[PDB]
Amino acid sequence: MKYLPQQDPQVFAAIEQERKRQHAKIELIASENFVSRAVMEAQGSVLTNKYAEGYPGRRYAGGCEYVDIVEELARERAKQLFGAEHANVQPHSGAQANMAVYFTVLEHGDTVLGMNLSHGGHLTHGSPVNFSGVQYNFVAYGVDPETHVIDYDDVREKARLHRPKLIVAAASAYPRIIDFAKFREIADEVGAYLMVDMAHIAGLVAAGLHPNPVPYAHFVTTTTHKTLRGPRGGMILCQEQFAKQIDKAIFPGIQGGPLMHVIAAKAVAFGEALQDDFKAYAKRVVDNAKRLASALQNEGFTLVSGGTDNHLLLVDLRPQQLTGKTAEKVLDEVGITVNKNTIPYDPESPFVTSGIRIGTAAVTTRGFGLEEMDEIAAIIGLVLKNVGSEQALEEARQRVAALTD
Amino acid sequence: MKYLPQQDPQVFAAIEQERKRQHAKIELIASENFVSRAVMEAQGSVLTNKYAEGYPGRRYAGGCEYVDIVEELARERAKQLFGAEHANVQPHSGAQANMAVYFTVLEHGDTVLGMNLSHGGHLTHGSPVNFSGVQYNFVAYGVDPETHVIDYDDVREKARLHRPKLIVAAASAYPRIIDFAKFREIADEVGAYLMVDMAHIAGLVAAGLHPNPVPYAHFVTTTTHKTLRGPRGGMILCQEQFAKQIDKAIFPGIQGGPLMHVIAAKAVAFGEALQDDFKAYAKRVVDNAKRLASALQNEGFTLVSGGTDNHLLLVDLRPQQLTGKTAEKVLDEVGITVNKNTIPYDPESPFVTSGIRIGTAAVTTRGFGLEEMDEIAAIIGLVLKNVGSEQALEEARQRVAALTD
Ligand SMILES: Cc1ncc(COP(=O)(O)O)c(CN[C@H](C(=O)O)[C@H](C)O)c1O
Numbered sequence: 001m002k003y004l005p006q007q008d009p010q011v012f013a014a015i016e017q018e019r020k021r022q023h024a025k026i027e028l029i030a031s032e033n034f035v036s037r038a039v040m041e042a043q044g045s046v047l048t049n050k051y052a053e054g055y056p057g058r059r060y061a062g063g064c065e066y067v068d069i070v071e072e073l074a075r076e077r078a079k080q081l082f083g084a085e086h087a088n089v090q091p092h093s094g095a096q097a098n099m100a101v102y103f104t105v106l107e108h109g110d111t112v113l114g115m116n117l118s119h120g121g122h123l124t125h126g127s128p129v130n131f132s133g134v135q136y137n138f139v140a141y142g143v144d145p146e147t148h149v150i151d152y153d154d155v156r157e158k159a160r161l162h163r164p165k166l167i168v169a170a171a172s173a174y175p176r177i178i179d180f181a182k183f184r185e186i187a188d189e190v191g192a193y194l195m196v197d198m199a200h201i202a203g204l205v206a207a208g209l210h211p212n213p214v215p216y217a218h219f220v221t222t223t224t225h226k227t228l229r230g231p232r233g234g235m236i237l238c239q240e241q242f243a244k245q246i247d248k249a250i251f252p253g254i255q256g257g258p259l260m261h262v263i264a265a266k267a268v269a270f271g272e273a274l275q276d277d278f279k280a281y282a283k284r285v286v287d288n289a290k291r292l293a294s295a296l297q298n299e300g301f302t303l304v305s306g307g308t309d310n311h312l313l314l315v316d317l318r319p320q321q322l323t324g325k326t327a328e329k330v331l332d333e334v335g336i337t338v339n340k341n342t343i344p345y346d347p348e349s350p351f352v353t354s355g356i357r358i359g360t361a362a363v364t365t366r367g368f369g370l371e372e373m374d375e376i377a378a379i380i381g382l383v384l385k386n387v388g389s390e391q392a393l394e395e396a397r398q399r400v401a402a403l404t405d
Numbered sequence: 406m407k408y409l410p411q412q413d414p415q416v417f418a419a420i421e422q423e424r425k426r427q428h429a430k431i432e433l434i435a436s437e438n439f440v441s442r443a444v445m446e447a448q449g450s451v452l453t454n455k456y457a458e459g460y461p462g463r464r465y466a467g468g469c470e471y472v473d474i475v476e477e478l479a480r481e482r483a484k485q486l487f488g489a490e491h492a493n494v495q496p497h498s499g500a501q502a503n504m505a506v507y508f509t510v511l512e513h514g515d516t517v518l519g520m521n522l523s524h525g526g527h528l529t530h531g532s533p534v535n536f537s538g539v540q541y542n543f544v545a546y547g548v549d550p551e552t553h554v555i556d557y558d559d560v561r562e563k564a565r566l567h568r569p570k571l572i573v574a575a576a577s578a579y580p581r582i583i584d585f586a587k588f589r590e591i592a593d594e595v596g597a598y599l600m601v602d603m604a605h606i607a608g609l610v611a612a613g614l615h616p617n618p619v620p621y622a623h624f625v626t627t628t629t630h631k632t633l634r635g636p637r638g639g640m641i642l643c644q645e646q647f648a649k650q651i652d653k654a655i656f657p658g659i660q661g662g663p664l665m666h667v668i669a670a671k672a673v674a675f676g677e678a679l680q681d682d683f684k685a686y687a688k689r690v691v692d693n694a695k696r697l698a699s700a701l702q703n704e705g706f707t708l709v710s711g712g713t714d715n716h717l718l719l720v721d722l723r724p725q726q727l728t729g730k731t732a733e734k735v736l737d738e739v740g741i742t743v744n745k746n747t748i749p750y751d752p753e754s755p756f757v758t759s760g761i762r763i764g765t766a767a768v769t770t771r772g773f774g775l776e777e778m779d780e781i782a783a784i785i786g787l788v789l790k791n792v793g794s795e796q797a798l799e800e801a802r803q804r805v806a807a808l809t810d
């Protein structure tokens with residue numbers, strides 16, 4: 001940076017603190033990742049100056065000739081990446097991506113079937129304090145209380161009873177592979193649309209390490225910033241028959257002018273995702289997660305679903321008689337960044353929780369391998385089995401500092 | 406740029422084309438502006454990597470210590486700039502800023518009174534193809550058919566008849582000063598909340614060249630990218646009594662994780678707005694607009710409301726027997742960037758129109774003064790009075806190229 005340090009010393013100092021923080025800490029938040037310098041330069045471009053309401057070629061303002069190319073590059077690369085018939089790269093976020101689909105196929109008060117929020121489901125999948133639960137009549141399916149795997153007989157029973165117009169699959173904290181073939185089979189029986197929110201697994205889908213929902217779902221929403229390792233924003237993939245309706249839902253439906261500089265960075269992210277190295281990266285993410293899962297069990301930790309098939313895992317902290325809130329606080333003290341997360345059938349409130357969510361996407365980008373996963377798990381064991389001991393937490397700090405160069 | 410040209414030659418080439426376009430063309434789109442290099446560097450920072458769901462101090466993820474400072478800087482500077490009791494700098498856009506307020510004080514199907522869309526009102530103020538008109542029962546007030554100034558007796562009659570829960574003031578294409586004192590007086594009579602969408606006039610309000618809606622309105626929404634000359638995004642200002650409700654409406658209401666890198670750029674933009682030079686800048690914008698308005702009339706153009714009190718003007722093209730669509734196309738051919746815009750009581754559809762919207766905010770940032778405004782108006786006269794003549798359009802191209810160095 002050059003012009004910011006002179007103009008705004010206060011903001012620059014806080015950014016420099018954050019930059020140094022991201023290097024010093026062990027980042028294990030499942031939804032986070034580190035973007036390339038090419039992605040950041042695209043978001044720091046003059047493309048923020050342009051109003052490009054509408055779509056490539058069909059704009060409601062002149063001078064969009066070159067931002068049209070940018071958006072088309074983002075749209076075509078995403079279609080190439082996921083094998084989708086249509087792409088919309090204008091959603092400001094995953095929340096707005098989900099919102100636009102709901103706006104398309106649903107009237108106010110319609111019944112929608114989503115995943116239980118305390119079982120792994122997301123806020124936009126029917127939270128009564130979120131727009132989804134207020135605007136629509138959301139019913140929930142759950143996981144098996146023993147295995148923590150989606151009970152597909154329960155998805156079928158809930159769909160046949162409540163008769164939803166839409167079924168939502170996918171989650172924020174689900175460590176296993178989602179059977180999209182079964183979700184479509186259930187949706188076909190009850191005559192409902194199938195939406196898959198692949199936000200967390202998007203990068204793994206692109207690398208072919210998680211089944212692609214695209215052939216099975218009518219709508220596929222995602223964020224670009226999670227395992228896809230791109231800028232902060234949303235995307236909608238759909239079939240050509242819904243293309244016009246989805247486009248009208250984004251604009252003039254729920255949004256206005258798109259973020260052309262972010263869309264530029266999305267294109268850069270999709271470009272990087274198409275390369276062979278990203279497929280090797282994503283395999284390391286899954287390898288690292290399974291290694292970390294196995295190593296934490298070795299330390300004596302119970303895991304939700306008994307491991308992982310993807311990028312994330314959930315530690316059931318009930319055996320250690322610790323809340324997720326307590327674990328989040330003490331690991332923050334030693335330099336490990338996690339978040340408290342409700343486990344399926346949690347006896348604690350969503351603000352206290354009985355578990356912690358851990359992802360490997362961020363550390364894998366940094367260069368962390370199977371060896372580092374053993375150490376990370378060893379530090380977590382040292383901290384959570386000796387919460388009252390300050391000497392163990394000091395030992396943990398030094399071991400965290402050793403891993404981060 | 407350094408890492409982008411190597412990584413993505415296709416995207417970099419399109420960005421470089423856009424960068425050169427923004428310099429070569431005369432940008433007169435009323436909603437557009439040029440951001441400083443400090444604002445862009447903040448959007449190109451590592452702050453995109455952080456999930457900061459919630460608010461400063463009250464986050465739902467660890468490691469937010471430094472992005473909290475960033476958001477607080479953005480919030481406090483905006484409060485200092487506008488004299489507001491509470492600020493929310495998390496809205497992804499002006500559309501989401503408006504959406505959050507609607508989500509706060511309104512139930513589905515509630516009656517809301519906004520400005521007529523063909524008279525100057527915005528898409529989010531009750532368009533039947535926008536979320537606002539679908540989710541809520543929007544009624545409209547208009548302008549006087551002769552003077553094109555808001556008919557405040559009509560605002561009062563519509564409010565007393567339809568009994569709205571909310572009244573919306575402000576516009577996308579209104580060249581005059583809005584009397585917020587009268588809007589609150591009407592709202593108090595019918596027992597309705599007053600929302601002001603100052604998106605277009607935000608920078609002029611900050612410089613004290615347009616009356617501040619904050620003392621009169623319960624809610625004030627805005628975009629940061631128009632006359633405020635900041636990054637692409639939204640902001641909500643409100644009284645302390647609505648602070649908690651507005652915060653809950655953004656998250657977990659309608660959005661998810663905020664754009665911390667954009668919020669950083671908002672802080673930089675607000676910082677630049679507080680400086681004395683920005684107040685001088687904004688006065689030049691208004692001076693330039695009034696100069697351009699007077700000069701276009703001298704050329705024989707009829708203007709909506711007979712001039713301007715702000716940053717923008719509307720040319721009534723009916724005397725020249727030209728549509729806004731025709732004017733937009735031919736001016737694009739010579740390097741002048743405007744947009745077609747419906748005039749009050751337009752005989753043409755919103756896709757054809759009888760007028761063009763022109764703003765001075767962008768050209769003023771570049772260094773254009775009163776002299777350049779005379780020339781811009783002279784070129785517009787040459788083009789629109791000689792549409793069939795290619796020799797006049799070639800003359801116009803050279804005169805446009807002369808103004809842009
Ligand atoms: C599966 C899923 N869909 C949408 C979103 C929201 O995206 P955005 O923040 O851009 O609006 C999420 C967000 N996930 C968060 C996280 O994992 O930390 C949190 C659970 O909301 C999501 O997981």
Ligand SMILES: Cc1ncc(COP(=O)(O)O)c(CN[C@H](C(=O)O)[C@H](C)O)c1O
Nearest residue numbers: 256257436498499500527576577602604
């Ligand atoms: C008065 C007003 N409020 C909100 C918006 C939408 O903001 P965003 O694009 O960030 O969602 C606008 C947009 N204005 C556009 C323009 O002037 O070019 C257009 C009329 O929508 C607005 O004017």
